[PDB]
Design a protein around this motif. Structure first.
Motif, PDB file in Angstrom:
ATOM      1  N   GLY A  40       0.822  -1.253   0.000  1.00 31.36           N
ATOM      2  CA  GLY A  40       0.000   0.000   0.000  1.00 31.36           C
ATOM      3  C   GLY A  40       0.836   1.275   0.000  1.00 31.36           C
ATOM      4  N   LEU A  41       2.179   1.175  -0.098  1.00 28.18           N
ATOM      5  CA  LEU A  41       3.132   2.316  -0.286  1.00 28.18           C
ATOM      6  C   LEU A  41       2.965   2.901  -1.704  1.00 28.18           C
ATOM      7  N   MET A  42       2.036   2.361  -2.517  1.00 28.85           N
ATOM      8  CA  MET A  42       1.862   2.626  -3.972  1.00 28.85           C
ATOM      9  C   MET A  42       0.742   3.637  -4.210  1.00 28.85           C
ATOM     10  N   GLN A  43       1.107   4.916  -4.128  1.00 29.80           N
ATOM     11  CA  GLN A  43       0.259   6.068  -4.517  1.00 29.80           C
ATOM     12  C   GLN A  43       0.261   6.214  -6.049  1.00 29.80           C
ATOM     13  N   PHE A  44      -0.884   6.562  -6.622  1.00 29.81           N
ATOM     14  CA  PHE A  44      -0.971   7.177  -7.969  1.00 29.81           C
ATOM     15  C   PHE A  44      -0.570   8.651  -7.850  1.00 29.81           C
ATOM     16  N   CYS A  65     -11.132   9.428  -0.278  1.00 31.95           N
ATOM     17  CA  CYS A  65     -11.565   8.245   0.490  1.00 31.95           C
ATOM     18  C   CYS A  65     -10.354   7.685   1.256  1.00 31.95           C
ATOM     19  N   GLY A  66      -9.205   7.503   0.606  1.00 33.21           N
ATOM     20  CA  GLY A  66      -7.976   6.963   1.223  1.00 33.21           C
ATOM     21  C   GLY A  66      -7.435   5.795   0.421  1.00 33.21           C
ATOM     22  N   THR A  67      -6.166   5.438   0.620  1.00 34.11           N
ATOM     23  CA  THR A  67      -5.506   4.243  -0.005  1.00 34.11           C
ATOM     24  C   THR A  67      -6.025   2.932   0.607  1.00 34.11           C
ATOM     25  N   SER A  68      -6.702   3.032   1.753  1.00 35.29           N
ATOM     26  CA  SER A  68      -7.311   1.933   2.544  1.00 35.29           C
ATOM     27  C   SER A  68      -8.703   1.551   2.007  1.00 35.29           C
ATOM     28  N   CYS A  69      -9.412   2.458   1.323  1.00 34.13           N
ATOM     29  CA  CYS A  69     -10.840   2.270   0.943  1.00 34.13           C
ATOM     30  C   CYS A  69     -11.028   0.959   0.174  1.00 34.13           C
ATOM     31  N   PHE A  70     -10.210   0.685  -0.837  1.00 32.75           N
ATOM     32  CA  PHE A  70     -10.409  -0.468  -1.740  1.00 32.75           C
ATOM     33  C   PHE A  70      -9.066  -1.174  -1.923  1.00 32.75           C
ATOM     34  N   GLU A  71      -9.088  -2.482  -2.166  1.00 32.29           N
ATOM     35  CA  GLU A  71      -7.892  -3.222  -2.640  1.00 32.29           C
ATOM     36  C   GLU A  71      -7.614  -2.764  -4.083  1.00 32.29           C
ATOM     37  N   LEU A  72      -6.396  -2.331  -4.378  1.00 34.15           N
ATOM     38  CA  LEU A  72      -6.014  -1.766  -5.686  1.00 34.15           C
ATOM     39  C   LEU A  72      -6.316  -2.751  -6.815  1.00 34.15           C
ATOM     40  N   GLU A  73      -5.983  -4.022  -6.664  1.00 38.10           N
ATOM     41  CA  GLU A  73      -6.224  -5.034  -7.715  1.00 38.10           C
ATOM     42  C   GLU A  73      -7.743  -5.151  -7.992  1.00 38.10           C
ATOM     43  N   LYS A  74      -8.567  -5.229  -6.945  1.00 37.42           N
ATOM     44  CA  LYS A  74     -10.035  -5.350  -7.120  1.00 37.42           C
ATOM     45  C   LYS A  74     -10.541  -4.043  -7.777  1.00 37.42           C
ATOM     46  N   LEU A  75     -10.071  -2.887  -7.338  1.00 36.78           N
ATOM     47  CA  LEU A  75     -10.603  -1.587  -7.836  1.00 36.78           C
ATOM     48  C   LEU A  75     -10.290  -1.453  -9.336  1.00 36.78           C
ATOM     49  N   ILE A 120     -15.277  -4.797  -4.529  1.00 35.73           N
ATOM     50  CA  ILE A 120     -14.476  -3.701  -3.937  1.00 35.73           C
ATOM     51  C   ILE A 120     -14.990  -3.376  -2.546  1.00 35.73           C
ATOM     52  N   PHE A 121     -16.187  -3.820  -2.169  1.00 40.05           N
ATOM     53  CA  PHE A 121     -16.764  -3.540  -0.826  1.00 40.05           C
ATOM     54  C   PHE A 121     -16.648  -4.746   0.138  1.00 40.05           C
ATOM     55  N   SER A 122     -15.901  -5.776  -0.250  1.00 38.71           N
ATOM     56  CA  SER A 122     -15.812  -7.101   0.422  1.00 38.71           C
ATOM     57  C   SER A 122     -15.456  -6.947   1.906  1.00 38.71           C
ATOM     58  N   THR A 123     -14.709  -5.910   2.302  1.00 36.97           N
ATOM     59  CA  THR A 123     -14.277  -5.674   3.711  1.00 36.97           C
ATOM     60  C   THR A 123     -15.347  -4.943   4.538  1.00 36.97           C
ATOM     61  N   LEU A 124     -16.490  -4.556   3.974  1.00 34.97           N
ATOM     62  CA  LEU A 124     -17.615  -3.986   4.775  1.00 34.97           C
ATOM     63  C   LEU A 124     -18.439  -5.105   5.425  1.00 34.97           C
ATOM     64  N   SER A 125     -19.035  -4.867   6.591  1.00 33.67           N
ATOM     65  CA  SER A 125     -20.078  -5.740   7.195  1.00 33.67           C
ATOM     66  C   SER A 125     -21.284  -5.843   6.255  1.00 33.67           C
ATOM     67  N   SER A 126     -22.142  -6.844   6.442  1.00 36.66           N
ATOM     68  CA  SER A 126     -23.405  -7.034   5.678  1.00 36.66           C
ATOM     69  C   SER A 126     -24.214  -5.732   5.703  1.00 36.66           C
ATOM     70  N   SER A 127     -24.287  -5.072   6.854  1.00 36.33           N
ATOM     71  CA  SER A 127     -25.210  -3.924   7.046  1.00 36.33           C
ATOM     72  C   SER A 127     -24.614  -2.677   6.381  1.00 36.33           C
ATOM     73  N   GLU A 128     -23.310  -2.455   6.524  1.00 33.07           N
ATOM     74  CA  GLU A 128     -22.529  -1.422   5.798  1.00 33.07           C
ATOM     75  C   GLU A 128     -22.554  -1.654   4.277  1.00 33.07           C
ATOM     76  N   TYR A 129     -22.426  -2.895   3.812  1.00 36.83           N
ATOM     77  CA  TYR A 129     -22.530  -3.232   2.371  1.00 36.83           C
ATOM     78  C   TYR A 129     -23.941  -2.853   1.906  1.00 36.83           C
ATOM     79  N   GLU A 130     -24.985  -3.256   2.639  1.00 37.07           N
ATOM     80  CA  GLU A 130     -26.381  -2.873   2.313  1.00 37.07           C
ATOM     81  C   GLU A 130     -26.550  -1.340   2.236  1.00 37.07           C
TER      82      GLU A 130
END
Ligand SMILES: Cc1cnc(C)n2nc(CCc3nc(N4CCC[C@@H]4C(F)(F)F)nn3C)nc12
Ligand SMILES: [Mg+2]
Ligand SMILES: [Zn+2]
Length: 313
Positions: free
Chosen positions: A1-5, A41-51, A153-163
């Motif tokens: 995650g040291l990989m900024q655009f 949002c941040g470098t944490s929001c999404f996995e770069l490969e999935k995004l 890209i939302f796989s790390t959210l809870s069911s209720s946060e994903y909803e």
């Protein structure tokens, strides 16, 4: 995650401004979007490969039409980025996550035709979705792509946060049906003027996010004049092709869609700025003061159309 655009200097500076134009280099648009996600949002929001896999499948599902194309998606996402970055503390983490995705997805698989043309043609989509036909389709396409393998890209959210995020996206995409904008804006105007507007009321936030969606969707009117004017050519290229398809069904198109009324475009823009665009940015600026540059740019472009009518341009 040291990989900024990182963007070249002119783009790094100008991307922060509301009137930024994303440029004619299609291959830079995915990086421009990831850059905006990472800052808003941040470098944490999404996995770069999935995004990256999601963005590329979204791109593939926009069509080669004159206006409602991949460049429009990224342009609408940039206007949202500028709104979010200018109102740092007004939005939740879920809202920052959902709204840039909603903007990128909001015209997925557009065919260059209005809801009204699908209903008159009797397209299958018009039987599946009786109102906001194309916008229910765009949301359904977004869910499809989110469900492809390696695209969640939302796989790390809870069911209720994903909803919750999928509901922010659904409402934001439905709100881009301009038929719904007039009513939304009138309720927001009354709520602001009677001081009943409450950003802790979910149904009020939903209205404010809807107006943000309209403002981003219409943002060609907030650009530098050469951008505005050349974008209008693409907008009418679609309308006039629809007009031709109306005449093939034996139906006089509305004037907006009749290429025989090419000459009235300047007067058509005035009507649109006064009835739609100016009211949109005026109410947005009341609710979210730091969005004022959108209103100022819109008014500058109205004055340019006024010059065209006087033959001063
Ligand atoms: C959704 C949207 C987003 N962004 C933009 C910049 N536009 N421009 C529009 C078209 C507006 C429009 N043009 C006309 N004209 C043109 C000539 C004939 C007819 C009139 F007789 F009025 F002159 N009627 N109307 C309503 N629609 C949008
Ligand atoms: Mg649309
Ligand atoms: Zn759009």
């Amino acid at each position: 995650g040291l990989m900024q655009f990182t963007l070249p200097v002119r783009l790094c500076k100008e991307i922060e401004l509301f009137h930024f134009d994303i440029g004619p280099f299609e291959n830079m648009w995915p990086g421009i979007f990831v850059y905006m996600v990472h800052r808003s949002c941040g470098t944490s929001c999404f996995e770069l490969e999935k995004l990256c896999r999601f963005i590329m499948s979204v791109k593939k599902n926009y069509r080669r039409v004159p206006y409602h194309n991949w460049k429009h998606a990224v342009t609408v996402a940039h206007c949202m980025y500028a709104i979010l970055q200018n109102n740092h503390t007004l939005f939740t983490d879920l809202e920052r996550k959902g709204l840039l995705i909603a903007c990128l997805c909001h015209d997925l698989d557009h065919r260059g035709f209005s809801n009204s043309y699908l209903q008159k043609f009797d397209h299958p989509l018009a039987a599946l979705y009786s109102t906001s036909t194309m916008e229910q389709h765009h949301f359904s396409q977004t869910v499809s792509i989110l469900q492809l393998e390696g695209h969640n890209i939302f796989s790390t959210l809870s069911s209720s946060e994903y909803e919750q995020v999928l509901e922010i996206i659904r409402k934001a995409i439905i709100a881009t049906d301009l038929a719904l904008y007039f009513g939304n804006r009138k309720q927001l105007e009354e709520m602001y003027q009677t001081g009943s507007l409450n950003l802790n009321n979910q149904s009020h936030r939903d209205r404010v996010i809807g107006l943000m969606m309209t403002a981003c969707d219409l943002c060609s009117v907030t650009k530098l004049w050469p951008v505005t004017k050349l974008t209008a050519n693409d907008i009418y290229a679609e309308f006039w092709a629809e007009g031709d398809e109306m005449k093939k069904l034996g139906i006089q198109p509305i004037p907006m869609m009749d290429r025989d009324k090419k000459d009235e475009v300047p007067q058509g823009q005035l009507g649109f700025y006064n009835a739609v665009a100016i009211p949109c940015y005026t109410t947005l600026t009341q609710i979210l003061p730091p969005t004022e540059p959108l209103l100022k740019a819109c008014r500058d472009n109205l004055s340019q159309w006024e010059k065209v009518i006087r033959g001063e341009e």
